[model samples]
Target: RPYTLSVALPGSILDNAQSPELRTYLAGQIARACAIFCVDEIVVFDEEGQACVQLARILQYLECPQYLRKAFFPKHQDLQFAGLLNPLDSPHHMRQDEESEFREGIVVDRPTRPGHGSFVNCGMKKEVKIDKNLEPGLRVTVRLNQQQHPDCKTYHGKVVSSQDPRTKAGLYWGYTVRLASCLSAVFAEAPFQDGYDLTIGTSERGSDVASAQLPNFRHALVVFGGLQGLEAGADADPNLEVAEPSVLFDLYVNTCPGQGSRTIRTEENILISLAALQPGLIQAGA
Candidate 1:
């Protein structure tokens, strides 16, 4: 069964916080969650259609194959400054040095025949040119090669032979992509409408998240509020109609039913909620 965990994150989650540091931690949390739970896809949305470029960048970096993590995040500071590469974990990072680099490639455009190859997005400024003609929207295994010049650095990748590019070595490879739209757009364009949309809130009217039937479905979208919880209508600000709640979400759930804390940060909510839900879902053959 295919499962997706979509979180409706606020644009302000890292507004005044240590952008890089917070992003790194959030990325690690997300990566660990996906790794532990075998989540197929992780989607993030900014409620007000605000851009989440930094969130997307870090998630994209962490989602890259372990062998490719070094290529994408080469500098120690790049990982350390973000708390991704700790001294204790540096040696394991070295273990990945010898493997030929592999990157997640999203086929952007397809060609009629295998001529000039299709354009693939391998997290580069330009769409990489693969030697194989693939269909659009195909996710493929791309073996990346690099070149350097005095002026700039150049990197490209080729589609590799793999029975399943998304799953490798008994581990699921998660994809991190951004939706530059609001909550309504996310819900409307969601791939699985049969699944549920859960809003983690403290509202009295919401459902007791403990009884949430998340694992029963093939996909689930969970939304979280930042700074302040989601307003009455899933809009962060009541004055603005950022999200159309009724059509956007199926239910509002208070995952933390009896919370001692007055406020639960978005990051905290994610860790807690996922922790609570993982056992049930995985045990039920998720």
Candidate 2:
């Protein structure tokens, strides 16, 4: 199985932009980078609760499929200019004519009694009947049947785990978003049971990323800071057990060495850092 990767991003990156539209697009670029690298989770860190939610919401909104958007995303101040941003165009964003066994869906209806199945809206111009009884307004991933039921003219499917797309078909479905009040909470409330097996912190003073190598790990987390840098983020965390920011991680490295620009925005840093780390991670996997 391929390893799981998560990214810890500072919501303060949104603060760097001037207008709401710019911030929205900034989040969109981050979403693009996350999908490009097959990142499993995105942890939004900020001391204030507002940045964490708004940033995470936009990231989550960008990742969701269009069909389910109407029911899932309601009117919000943060999403007013989201339409200007580009779509993730990930595999799960299936077209009207395209055919795929795995699909992203929402449970529009739940089990009644006789059938004990849920009706899922897979954006196929009709709702598909799932074999499991999930609650209404619930989101689920389904494995679709080859053909529709001749009598009802409805497609049939079975509810499947979110990981099925990647594990079964090597598809990059999308990334999961998490809101953390501070840097410490990013790890404290990790979704994974054992937490991140490997953690890396990126900083200008750290080792060169090109010279770095990764060890075998089931789950790895790479963190990026915002305008003030990662040091400020770690300083804001009350739960930090140590004084040094570098010691809080397994590896500390600089993804870009001798950079030409005065500052690398968080969005650009994500692309550069993840790209630089790919070969190292690939070697570890092999």
Candidate 3:
């Protein structure tokens, strides 16, 4: 988030671009420093405002092999990275959306603690139902859970206004997350949906589940809807990599169905990595 002084010295540094004395002074110092280390060539940053021109000249003089020059720049600040809307430089920009599933915690060791938390798993087999209200945009957030804190907590995503063909559980929702998705550092929000099927605890019937244990009222995360990658231009001389983030519009969900008008309005924040150490495997959006 911090900008370096060297980056801002463009125009000021290049003002004396044509001055032989200044050029020699700066370039000489750069070349000397490189020579001292047994280096072949030296490229001085045009502190006098010749950055663009100076850099071009330096490349030409040194005959640099690599044409790519990496630099710092900001990307979508509003939409969560989970969804990219109109990417800055690619063909895929604003082309596709992303999706994910969440997990609930489980009790493995303690026999004394028969039913503690309901960890999310792809196979948690209860007849689940979902609806679509994503016209404005989906906003995710955390409300309340028996475990209090979770290993991760943030959630951001969006959904289309249509029913799902597979689960029939409204494929509308997309880009899901739980504690790990939220980046929670602790193992919190242990599942308390203790028993069989229909209840938060062990009860099979919905009535057995008390108000405190109902997930219906818990709304902690929101997922934005669109995202994409850009392709380079046709010409190699003017190559560019376009990328952008989704535009997160606000949409409120009525957690408790038929609750007669209690709506929460908030947008979700997409998560992005500060570095690209691992490309796809480690790539996650907020």
Candidate 4:
């Protein structure tokens, strides 16, 4: 019915970076790659060490709409470095002044019985009420209904999941961050009812992906490893039966075979791999 692109990234990307700025930017690059390529799910796997948490935390912080940030992640240390990063600037990064039929909303507070709904902060003059009451501090994409009010706007948006905007409106809303315990966990923890049909493990030692037509499949996954690469992680995983990283996925590819530099970091490989896959990736029901 629909197609989704998921990228599995190694958690310990920073290599124990001491500087807060360096740590922040590395995660930022990962975030940028996800948004640029319209990546749906970012599976953070612990390839080597540095158990994944803050990187996922920062990815969440970066992807969240500006209006809903206050309600969801107010002044957290994990998100302190996010300000320096460039915004995703996706279609969903709408401005309050800009009139739109749909906008990202937050369940700011619980409304009373008389109201028969909860007040949602939708970056309006005043918090608007939703069609239903929801738990406070929850993220909802609102299908805004314009109505005549005493002074300003009256909100009665039907509560919808973050996925609604992307499917219904053809918008690249944002990416979801998922934490995997290990290399094998990445495949085991797939959110899709049907797992990734086409999975590519990007490795330099693998065959070149240059000018080769990729497999036709929906719900694809392109996994990128940490500093040491996917093979290192595959070797470390206890549960994985495969001797090489290539065996786990449908195809193991070297996105960019020839390079000027010795190393192509995970973040860099993400850009290369996604760009390469774009042409051949056939959308399921487009």
Question: By TM-score, who's the top model here?
Answer: 2
The estimated TM-scores of all candidates read 0.60, 0.95, 0.15, 0.91
Rank the models by lDDT, top first: 2, 4, 1, 3
Residues 74-185, candidate 4, lDDT per residue (tens digit)?
Answer: 6877778777787888777878787777777777665578758887877866677678878887777887766636665564667777777777777888899999888888
lDDT digits (tens) for residues 1-286 of candidate 3: 1110000011123334365444434432322222222221122212212343443243222221111111111232211221211112211111113122321111112222233222211112321112222112122211122332233442222222211211243211111111211111101232223211111111111121113222222112222111111111111112222232111111121222333433211110111111111121122211
Across 51-85, the per-residue lDDT of candidate 1 in tens digits comes to 36556666666656454454455565435645443
Q: Sorted by TM-score, highest first, which candidate order results?
A: 2, 4, 1, 3
Worst 10-residue lDDT window for candidate 2 reads 108-117
Model number with the top lDDT? 2
lDDT tens readout by residue for model 2, 1-286 = 6788999988778877898888888888989999999898999988435767888999999899988888899999988997899998999997867889888988876446776687888898667887877768988999988777777767898999898889899898898998888888888899989878889988887999877778888889999988787878777776775666788889999999999988888888889999999888877765
Worst 10 residues of 1 by lDDT: 85-94
lDDT of 4: 0.79
Tell me the TM-score of model 1.
0.60
Q: Find the 10 residues in a row with the least total lDDT in model 4.
A: 277-286
* lDDT of the structure predicted as candidate 2: 0.85
Q: Whole-model Cα lDDT per candidate?
A: 0.55, 0.85, 0.21, 0.79
